[PDB]
Amino acid sequence: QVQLLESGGGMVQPGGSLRLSCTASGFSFSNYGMSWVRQAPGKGPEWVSGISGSSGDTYYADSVKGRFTISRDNSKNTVNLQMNSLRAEDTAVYYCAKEGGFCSSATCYYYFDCWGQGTLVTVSSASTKGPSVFPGTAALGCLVKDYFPEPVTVSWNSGALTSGVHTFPAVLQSSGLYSLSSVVTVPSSSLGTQTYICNVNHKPSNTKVDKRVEPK
Amino acid sequence: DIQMTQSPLSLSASVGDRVTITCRATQSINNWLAWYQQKSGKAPKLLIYKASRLESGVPSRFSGSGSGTEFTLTISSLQPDDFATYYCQQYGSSWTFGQGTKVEIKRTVAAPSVFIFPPSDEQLKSGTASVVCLLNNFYPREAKVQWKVDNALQSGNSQESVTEQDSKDSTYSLSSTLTLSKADYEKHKVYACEVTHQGLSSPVTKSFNRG
């Protein structure tokens, strides 16, 4: 049973530093070489860092060369990535990978056969903000705007009526806050008959705001 | 310093179809090429390594061909579990990924239903106005949303977001948000979003007066 477990991700300000970890088990850590692969939301994956199993040769991506530092402790079966001077473009989801097949030499290039779950690294001047809920056939919904951080949970009538509901992915604005929407379609004749209340919860701020949708 | 370019960027197909994805390298990488499958919310999974070797447990319908600078991935008979994005990766010199190939679920063309939403009184009382135009359950994914303020088409001041294909009916949904200050919103009366789409014979205009 081969598995990789990440740890260390979180939230930092631009210019700050952060440290990742990855505990491996199930195989012979000393033999296989490791690597760190990240993927920014909305783009393709990119290789970031890489280290051999025993020799100690290390490689870094062009966009991160000189800032990051990859290391491993074969005695404790851990590989760690130190991320100094983090920037906005460094915000991504970071994985640790394992070399596929084998290597006859000491350090070499490879494909990744086993991956970790994935840890999240966010870099922003984090103004912590709570979510703002706003209230023949026509569709209604709730608009959550300007919240930090992710995620927000929206439900209609406490999860009872869920058919025809489409919750949209959030977008990031030049100010640093998020915004999304959750819609649902109903016949306009059910304004006063059917009452729709969206239940927007924000676990980081411990703030739930219910805004009843009444006929306007 | 080798750059990997996949072709096609996106392709919509049906179960049973033959699907071929191309992957090109800048410099010659002999046969050090891998392919991965990723589903939304899941880790990537290895499909093929060393250009032509199948990863254990991958179905027999996946195969791979090529050497040098040109490579292909072929799915002999596409299955429901196979709708996903596919990436190639070279490891002949360092490690670089292709840009991704999206396999969209094929379905019949569907016109969006269009709705416009004024900013709410609760929002206005706070100093910002967001006007929303919704395009509901459409196909294909390619769609144009245009914002008109006093019938003046807007550009540069909107952002959009689109969902993946619905797992029940294979449609898409799309959000577009126009953000203006409360002041600028109150200087004008007529707000209109006009939608052109391949499912619509002609542009649909939906419109209100702020009152």
Author numbering:
A (entry chain A): 1 to 52, 52A, 53 to 82, 82A, 82B, 82C, 83 to 100, 100A, ...
B (entry chain B): 1 to 94, 96 to 212
Q: Please, what does the article write about this entry?
A:
Antibodies against the repeat can mediate protection from Plasmodium infection in animal models. However, anti-NANP antibody– mediated protection is not readily achieved through vaccination. Thus, the induction of protective PfCSP NANP antibodies is a major goal in pre-erythrocytic vaccine development.
In addition to VH3-33– Vκ1-5–KCDR3:8, we observed a cluster of highly mutated, affinity-matured VH3-23–Vκ1-5 NANPreactive memory B cell antibodies in our selection. After the immunization of malaria-naïve individuals with PfSPZ-CVac, ~15% of PfCSP-reactive memory B cells showed VH3-33–Vκ1-5–KCDR3:8 or VH3-23–Vκ1-5 sequence characteristics. Furthermore, these cells were strongly enriched in the expanded anti-PfCSP memory B cell pool compared with the nonexpanded population.
